[PDB]
């Protein structure tokens, strides 16, 4: 709201360990294969399944409530297996959002309730708008905005994304405290 990030008070129940905060409400079925190296946030009722995964997330990663990050299955003639996805640094997944994406780049703002397709690659410094469908096996270049049910080039982003996005994710993390 007018550049400034607003207050969000968390409850007592949340798994805070080595900077990484993960809501107890949010199930993450397969805790072994999933890894959170940095000071990540995972909001309540969110899913990070371990269906033969290697879900590596960023330094300041944010996943809002009711949102799912599942790896896609690669339809290979040699052997059909689930491809391990790698969420980049400073990644912001918005609320109620579906992600079946392989290799999500750093410094990205994925919009609200937007379905990303199977085996979908996202390069760094991009932005997917809200109520948008990226089809299976699609690529989005840097400094781009993809939107619509087709999921196609809408326009370009501001030049200063790399520097700006840092402030957003770090401010949200700092502003997001217990009550």
């Amino acid at each position: 709201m007018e550049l400034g990030e607003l207050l969000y008070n968390k409850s007592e129940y949340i798994e805070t360990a080595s900077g990484n905060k993960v809501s107890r409400q949010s199930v993450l079925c397969g805790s072994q294969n999933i890894v959170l190296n940095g000071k990540t946030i995972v909001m309540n009722d969110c899913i990070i399944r371990g269906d033969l995964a290697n879900v590596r997330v960023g330094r300041h990663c944010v996943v809002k409530s009711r949102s799912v990050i599942r790896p896609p299955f690669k339809k290979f003639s040699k052997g059909v297996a689930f491809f391990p996805l790698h969420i980049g640094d400073h990644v912001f997944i918005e609320e109620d959002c579906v992600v079946n994406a392989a290799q999500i780049g750093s410094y990205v703002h994925v919009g609200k309730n937007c379905v990303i397709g199977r085996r979908c690659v996202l390069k760094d410094c991009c932005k997917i708008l809200d109520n948008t469908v990226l089809p299976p096996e699609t690529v989005v270049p840097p400094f781009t905005v993809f939107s619509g049910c087709p999921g196609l080039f809408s326009g370009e982003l501001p030049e200063c994304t790399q520097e700006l996005m840092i402030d957003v994710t770090k401010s949200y993390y700092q502003k997001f405290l217990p009550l």
Binding site: P150, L152, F153, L164, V168
Partner: protein
């Protein structure tokens, strides 16, 4: 940029045309002392690239190829980057289930090299008219 409403508080530019824009969009000019907008500044062309198969093409090759990638294709029904599927290759979309078999294009033995667009029907008549007017203009 969008999550925080950068499109609220705006900075003004000095010159002929006055514009109200967010600081995120604006650029500072160091040669002189006056910040200028994306509108005010002149735009150039550096490099061309495909959004699917990210391959930096030179300016000369683009003019010959009509600003297009040879390997990658976009579906006609919906506007999305197609994918090569085998059984010996057919072109299919992920969003809509439009195939290359539907319109009746034959499957190619080689993956990329085989696929092509038919020649323009009035291409021979075109060159004859240019050469006539070229001689007449001379």
């Amino acid at each position: 940029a969008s999550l925080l409403q950068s499109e609220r508080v705006l900075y003004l530019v000095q010159g002929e045309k006055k514009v109200r824009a967010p600081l995120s969009q604006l650029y500072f000019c160091r040669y002189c002392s006056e910040l200028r907008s994306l509108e005010c500044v002149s735009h150039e062309v550096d490099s061309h690239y495909c959004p699917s198969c990210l391959e930096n093409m030179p300016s000369a090759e683009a003019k010959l190829k009509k600003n297009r990638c040879a390997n990658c294709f976009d579906c006609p029904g919906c506007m999305h980057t197609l994918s090569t599927r085998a059984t010996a290759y057919y072109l299919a979309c992920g969003f809509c289930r439009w195939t290359s078999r539907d319109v009746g294009m034959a499957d190619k033995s080689v993956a990329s090299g085989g696929w092509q667009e038919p020649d323009h029907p009035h291409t021979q008549r075109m060159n004859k008219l240019i050469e006539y007017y070229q001689q007449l203009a001379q």
